[PDB]
Every structure is written in C-alpha cells, then in structure tokens.
Design a protein around this ligand. Sequence first.
Ligand SMILES: *[C@@H]1O[C@H](CO)[C@@H](O)[C@H](O)[C@H]1NC(C)=O
Ligand SMILES: *[C@@H]1O[C@H](CO)[C@@H](O)[C@H](O)[C@H]1NC(C)=O
Ligand SMILES: *[C@@H]1O[C@H](CO)[C@@H](O)[C@H](O)[C@H]1NC(C)=O
Ligand SMILES: *[C@@H]1O[C@H](CO)[C@@H](O)[C@H](O)[C@H]1NC(C)=O
Ligand SMILES: *[C@@H]1O[C@H](CO)[C@@H](O)[C@H](O)[C@H]1NC(C)=O
Lengths: 289, 109, 88
Amino acid sequence: CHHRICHCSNRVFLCQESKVTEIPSDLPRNAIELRFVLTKLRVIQKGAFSGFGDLEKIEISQNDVLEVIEADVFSNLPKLHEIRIEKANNLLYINPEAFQNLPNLQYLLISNTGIKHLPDVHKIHSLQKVLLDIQDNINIHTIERNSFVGLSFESVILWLNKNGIQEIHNSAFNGTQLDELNLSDNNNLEELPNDVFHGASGPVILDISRTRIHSLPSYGLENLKKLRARSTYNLKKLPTLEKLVALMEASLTYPSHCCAFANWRICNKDYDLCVDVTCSPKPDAFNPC
Amino acid sequence: NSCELTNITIAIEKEECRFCISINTTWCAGYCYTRDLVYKDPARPKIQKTCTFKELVYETVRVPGCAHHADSLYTYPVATQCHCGKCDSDSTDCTVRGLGPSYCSFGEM
Amino acid sequence: QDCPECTLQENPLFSQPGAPILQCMGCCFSRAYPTPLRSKKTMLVQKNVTSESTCCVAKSYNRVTVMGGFKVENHTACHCSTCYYHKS
Ligand SMILES: *[C@@H]1O[C@H](CO)[C@@H](O)[C@H](O)[C@H]1NC(C)=O
Ligand SMILES: *[C@@H]1O[C@H](CO)[C@@H](O)[C@H](O)[C@H]1NC(C)=O
Ligand SMILES: *[C@@H]1O[C@H](CO)[C@@H](O)[C@H](O)[C@H]1NC(C)=O
Ligand SMILES: *[C@@H]1O[C@H](CO)[C@@H](O)[C@H](O)[C@H]1NC(C)=O
Ligand SMILES: *[C@@H]1O[C@H](CO)[C@@H](O)[C@H](O)[C@H]1NC(C)=O
C-alpha cells in the first residue's frame, strides 16, 4: 500500500514527520487505523475524521505545534473504540463540541498535553464500558459539576491522576456509573466535598494517594471495596466500618487505621472465587494496638 | 517471561549542529504473558505487565560540537536489571509506539 | 523459559463440558529505551525513559451467561494490542 504523504500498510495509515502540516483530503475512507505522529499540525480541522465508517483507532502523538481540537472532529465514526491524544505540549484548548456521538468508544487517552480543562464528553453516549484515562495534564486544575454525564450508558473507569487538580465541584460525578476513580498524584487537591458522589453509582475502587485530602465523604462509599490512600497524610480520620461495609482491601498511610480494620468482619461455585479487610501498613514492630 | 537485558544503539541529537551520535548501550526488550479478562467485574484484577527497567543508572557522554557551537555533555539512563512489571508512569513514557531508540531528526544508520 | 504467543485458551473457572469459555492469553513484544530528544521537545512533563508495549487482548468476542448468572465474554479472536492497565 502507498499514499501521497502518509505511510500505509493493511488499511493502517501513519502520517509522520514535519512534511505533514494538514490532515490529507485524499485519505481512504476504508481506513482501519489512522496515526498522526511528529507532525507540524497547528489545528485538527472541523470534522476531519468524519466518514471513516470502518475506522476503529486514532493516534495523535508527539505534535509540538498542535494548539486546538475543533468542533465536530470526532463525529460519524460507528466503529471507533480507541483515541490516543499523547504528548501535545502546546495543545491548550478542546472545543466542547469535539467529541460527538461515539457509540463504540472504549478508551480515551489524553496524556501529557497542555489542556487547561477536561474534555467535554456529554455527547459521546457510548454503548461500551469506557476508560477515560487523563494523566500528566498539569494545566487541568478543576473537575466541574456533571463532568462525566452522558459519556456512557455503561459503567466507567476514571483515571484523573497526575494532573493539576485542586478543586472538585459538588455532583462532578452525577449521572455516572463509577467503577474506578483515580485522583492520585494531584498534590494541590485539598478536599473532597460531601456531595462529590451525588447521583453516581460507586466507585468500587478509589485512589486518593499522594493528595492533601483531609477527609472522605459521609455517603457514596457504600460500594467502595478497594481504597488506596498511600502518602495521604492529611486524612488521619476514616469512616467507621458501618459506612465502609463493602470495603474488603485498603492500602493506607497510618498503621493505626489498619488495627481498627482487624478483629472485626457463602457463595455457590489466581481468582477470588465469589475474607476480611486486606490492610497495609500492618506492622507489629511499634503498633500502637 | 522472556524479558532481558538486550544491547541497543541509541541516538543523541545535538539540535544546534544538525546531527546525532550513535552510542551502543544496554536496555530492555522481550516478551511478557498477559490475560484479557473474561469476567469484567469492577474489583477484578485488571493488571498487565510490560518488559521494562527494574533498576537503572545515568551515564554521561561527551557529545561533539561543530562550528560556532562547542562540544556539550549529555546524560542518559541505562538499564541495569529488566523485569516484566508495571510501567513506571512517573519516569517512563508508557505507550504503544515511540519514535525509536535510534531516532534522529537529521539521518539514520 | 520461552513465551507462548497470544492465543485463545480455555478458561478454567467459567469453562464447563460442552460449553467452554475461550480467553485471550499469551505473550506479546514489549520494550524500553531512553526517550529521543525529538520526543522530549513535545513532552510538557519530562519522561527520560520510553516504554513501547503491546498486550494480549480479544480482537472480538460474544457476551454469554453461565453458572446460574455470570455475564462473561467468550473470546473469538486474539491479538497483541494496546495496554490499558500496565501503568503505575
Ligand atoms: C444530574 O444528572 C441528571 C442527568 O443524569 C440531570 O438531569 C440533573 O440535572 C443533574 N443534577 C445536578 C445536580 O446537576
Ligand atoms: C552486550 O554487549 C556487550 C559488549 O559488546 C557484551 O559483553 C554482552 O555479551 C552483550 N550481550 C548482552 C545480553 O548484554
Ligand atoms: C557498537 O557500535 C558499533 C557502531 O559504532 C556497531 O557496529 C557494533 O555492532 C556495536 N557493538 C560492538 C561490540 O562494537
Ligand atoms: C463459547 O464458544 C465456543 C466456541 O464458539 C462454544 O463451543 C461454546 O459453546 C461457547 N460457550 C458458551 C458458554 O456459550
Ligand atoms: C532526565 O534527563 C535530563 C537530561 O536529559 C535531566 O535533567 C534529568 O535530571 C534526568 N533525570 C530525571 C530523574 O529526570
């Protein structure tokens, strides 16, 4: 296979190097995979990847002159399950109309970009379980109300770790089925408001490791099974096992918290074929319990 | 399983002199066993290993100059131990494809 | 010592006689090397090491229900593709 500027092999198109300044008009509609690496793209044009009814994967990596993702860009793609927006140091803005109806989306990666805000996902409406993985985006400082509603009709995994988050609004997770939520390595994050988990299932897994979070909310943790709070020094007070009923594993900071989980606590049939809280740090060298 | 210390050739790019220098070093490459889970439970063990550095060291090499631009120093990491484990997102770029260890903006081998 | 390729195998837990459950499992190529400077120019957060990795995942499947009530996948095809759960 051969294209004017993009390298091609088995309906897979890799558009690499500085010679690539605009997304080619002559890209075959049958394309399965489309990659844009090391390009001198300044903007990804309004409705650029619309029409590729076969296209299942998109990659936008290592583009140092990309600044904006226009409206209607990720539209008319019934077969797309994966988008990867990686290493885009000058990408500051994403039009709240960029992510359109993507019914088979399974993975959205936004890593190491300069984006000032989270992506607008209310128009995705995927039929699939979605993994929204947003990491190393130091210019993202706030998760606003209803940030993930309409992303999926299915349960969702939300990796919002290693960004620059310091504010989380009430109901930020409303109208969402939260499977897993990772807020770790957002060091400036000082508090989890009480209505953070308002109108949201779960999460089953929560990671607040290496955060200045002082306390957990009174409700919303009724489904929490795994809590990861490594180097979460501002906590010190945890909810009672009457509130964390579902909790079965917990990797915390203070060994005093583990002592409280010990000494207190079937199904028809490595694998968990279905007993107490698997807590750490658990040292006996100093206790105190 | 078959993740081990392999010999590689890397490119050190002196942008100002419009060339790269080749340096044979030791890094990681090989195969790791993975399992795609059949039962998608939120508390399931969704964990995948990759072939990557277990421990590393930094090495400084003298990169030549040309004209109007003097010879500089460049520090690069070297694999010391490889393992099939988690990709350390803190230090590593955990991706599908990179530009290649011997990537140069001005040539090839 | 060797690493068998990513292919369909019978799931021990969910499989039953006459009705096995097929799962993608095996080995895929993954590597690591220092990040080229060209890449470092596009990274707002610097990463000195670069990991290129692929994982054993189902190319296609069919949602089924077994052992009274378990919504499990019966994998029909496998390939080494994108790793979603390999990072720390
Ligand atoms: C919560 O989400 C629903 C849609 O799922 C919406 O109708 C409602 O206004 C939202 N509530 C708040 C508090 O924003
Ligand atoms: C790597 O290269 C060095 C020097 O050429 C050699 O001693 C060594 O045997 C090679 N093999 C491995 C696996 O490191
Ligand atoms: C080291 O690099 C040279 C190129 O400079 C290459 O030809 C050779 O295979 C490498 N290994 C040894 C042991 O010289
Ligand atoms: C899984 O797929 C195999 C092959 O298509 C089939 O024989 C088997 O009946 C399926 N298992 C279930 C539980 O439907
Ligand atoms: C990363 O590499 C650069 C030089 O290439 C250096 O400034 C930095 O200290 C290295 N080490 C770490 C741990 O980032």
